[PDB]
Amino acid sequence: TQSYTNSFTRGVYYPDKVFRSSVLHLTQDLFLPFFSNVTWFHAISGPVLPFNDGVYFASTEKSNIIRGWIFGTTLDSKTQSLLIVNNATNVFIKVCEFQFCNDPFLDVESESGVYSSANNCTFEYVSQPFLMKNLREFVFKNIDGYFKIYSKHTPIIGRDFPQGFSALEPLVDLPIGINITRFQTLLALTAGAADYYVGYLQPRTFLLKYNENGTITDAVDCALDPLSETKCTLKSFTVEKG
Amino acid sequence: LPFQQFGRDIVDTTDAVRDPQTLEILDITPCSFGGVSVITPGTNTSNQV
Ligand SMILES: *[C@@H]1O[C@H](CO)[C@@H](O)[C@H](O)[C@H]1NC(C)=O
Ligand SMILES: *[C@@H]1O[C@H](CO)[C@@H](O)[C@H](O)[C@H]1NC(C)=O
Ligand SMILES: *[C@@H]1O[C@H](CO)[C@@H](O)[C@H](O)[C@H]1NC(C)=O
Ligand SMILES: *[C@@H]1O[C@H](CO)[C@@H](O)[C@H](O)[C@H]1NC(C)=O
Ligand SMILES: *[C@@H]1O[C@H](CO)[C@@H](O)[C@H](O)[C@H]1NC(C)=O
């Protein structure tokens, strides 16, 4: 099932590790435009989800059936594909070519239920798993080969998409460069339902605000409405009459 | 911040840095500089300055 909901003012992450104090720094980078369309995939029991320069992901279910992601070009044994599985104890990262299975899924816990075979697979990396009423936000983008994942865990209210402001801190990075064109989530599995949101990132310009502690508190999306353009031109959050 | 180590002033210059070995916060200040002025009466009066 598919629907549409307003993106509101969510999807802001720290662009770097540079400390700033009481600054209104203006950054030009990839972000999620304010008040956009996010495809709400809810109650799917059993798609494609084409991958671009940047994507978005958020979920709040406690069923733990949502885990892992697949990246690649054709999802075939003729082209290398990046498979990431964040299971309970660690995370699996590998670059391998295979025909996969009938449907890539974790046979609850046979990882062979996703991939059928392997090829030249010199690279293999294992790290701390991402898992550690609540809302989980993630940002997956691949720039100049480097794979960056930003995440944050916040206590949600209810089960619908809430409001408010919260910035995402970077967690991991990896310099593995391969042709990535399509991505698809993984479900471990008798019927059921699941809910998650997908957004697309575009190159925009923002006006971040750092408090005295260096924490992001507010942002302004330039080129959205004339007031935002005025604020970005003045580099201020309050405008006098004129 | 736990993941931040660099510093930045109002515009473009570093003013803080974190010690790579131990978790320390310390500033950076450029070494002193300035102009030099000479005070003197006329050479028809004296030669000390
Ligand atoms: C999303 O797309 C619909 C048309 O498909 C459009 O009417 C709407 O303004 C767009 N934005 C939001 C926030 O719904
Ligand atoms: C990468 O994948 C795209 C999508 O299938 C394909 O068109 C392209 O030829 C592949 N290789 C390069 C170098 O882009
Ligand atoms: C979870 O991932 C770790 C990573 O090495 C692996 O050792 C472990 O077997 C996995 N758990 C299961 C149940 O397969
Ligand atoms: C395996 O070898 C082929 C032969 O050129 C190469 O194209 C492919 O990238 C290799 N696989 C990996 C994971 O490097
Ligand atoms: C930053 O530190 C100051 C001084 O302790 C504190 O008042 C402020 O609340 C802190 N801001 C945070 C933790 O976001």
Swiss-Prot record, chain A:
Residues 4-234 form the BetaCoV S1-NTD domain. It comes from the Viruses. Changing residue 43 to V: In strain: Eta/B.1.525, Omicron/BA.1. Residues 211-232 are annotated as: Putative superantigen. Disulfide bonds join 96-121, 222-232. Glycans are attached at residues 37, 87, 120, 179, 213. Changing residue 103 to Y: In strain: Gamma/P.1. Changing residue 60 to I: In strain: Iota/B.1.526, Mu/B.1.621, B.1.1.318, Omicron/BA.1. Changing residue 67 to I: In strain: A23.1. Changing residue 136 to S: In strain: Gamma/P.1. Attaches the virion to the cell membrane by interacting with host receptor, initiating the infection. The major receptor is host ACE2. When S2/S2' has been cleaved, binding to the receptor triggers direct fusion at the cell membrane. When S2/S2' has not been cleaved, binding to the receptor results in internalization of the virus by endocytosis using host TFRC and GRM2 and leading to fusion of the virion membrane with the host endosomal membrane. Alternatively, may use NRP1/NRP2 and integrin as entry receptors. Binds to host ACE2. RBD also interacts with the N-linked glycan on 'Asn-90' of ACE2. Cleavage of S generates a polybasic C-terminal sequence on S1 that binds to host Neuropilin-1 (NRP1) and Neuropilin-2 (NRP2) receptors. Interacts with host integrin alpha-5/beta-1 (ITGA5:ITGB1) and with ACE2 in complex with integrin alpha-5/beta-1 (ITGA5:ITGB1). May interact via cytoplasmic c-terminus with M protein. May interact (via N-terminus) with host bilirubin and biliverdin, thereby preventing antibody binding to the SARS-CoV-2 spike NTD via an allosteric mechanism. This is Spike protein S1. It comes from Severe acute respiratory syndrome coronavirus 2 (2019-nCoV). The chain holds residues 28 to 311 of 1273 of the full protein.
